[PDB]
Amino acid sequence: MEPLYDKNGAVLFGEPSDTHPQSTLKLPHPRGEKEVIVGIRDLPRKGDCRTGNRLGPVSGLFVKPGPVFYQDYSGPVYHRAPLEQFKQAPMCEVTKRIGRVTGSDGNLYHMYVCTDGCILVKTAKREGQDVLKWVYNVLDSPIWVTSC
């Protein structure tokens, strides 16, 4: 299974991997001043990183199924989409584009939020295309989608 990372960037199990260079997650990077939940209408800005915003500190954008969005998070997170927890699906009606995530397969995916509330990824590179929905969350932990 795909490893989780602590807020110092240390792998909590398994072996560490690096993120895709074209991911919106840029490491290394601090986080974890507070766990800050936000609404999808309220997703943080580039502008918000050093200041924070009215809702609190901002280390970027985290997401897990629900959907639940966060602008900072302190506990274990994925740095790559745990694709063993995703299943092939037809493209959905997208409500929001939220970033460019590394897959546990090492590829780059665009990540979207669907109108049905599902989190969906679709291969970013030309060729070898896939469409997948985040269906299981056995460690109930978010992906760190973007760093500010």
Which one is catalytic: 20, 29, 79, 118? Answer: 29
Q: Which is nearer to ligand [O-], 61 or 113 (CB)?
A: 61
Please return the burial class of 46, using the count of CB atoms within 10 Å of its CB with bins 0-12, 13-18 and 19+.
exposed
Q: Is 83 left (phi over 0), alpha (psi -120 to 50) or beta?
A: alpha
Is residue 79 annotated as part of the catalytic site, yes or no?
no
The least CB distance from residue 25 to ligand [O-], in Å, is: 14
Nearer to ligand [O-], 41 or 50 (CB): 50
Judged by CB, which is closer to ligand [O-]: 2, or 48?
48
Cβ-closest position to ligand [O-]:
49
> Of residues 49, 110, 114, 118, which has the active-site annotation?
49
Q: How far is the CB of 148 from ligand [O-] (least distance, A)?
A: 4
Chain residues binding ligand [O-] by CB under 6 A are 46-49, 148
Give whichever of 61 and 101 is closer to ligand [O-], judged by the CB atom: 61
* Three-class DSSP category at 84: helix
Tokens of 98: 């939220």
Task: Tell me the closest approach of the beta carbon of residue 12 to ligand [O-], in angstroms.
Answer: 27
DSSP E strands in the chain: the ranges are 36-38, 60-64, 68-72, 86-88, 94-102, 108-114, 119-123, 131-134, 143-147
> Whole-number minimum distance, CB 58 to ligand [O-], in Å?
7
> How many whole angstroms separate alpha carbon 74 and alpha carbon 33?
7
Question: Would you call 41 helix, strand, or coil by DSSP?
Answer: helix
Q: Give the catalytic positions in this structure.
A: 29, 49
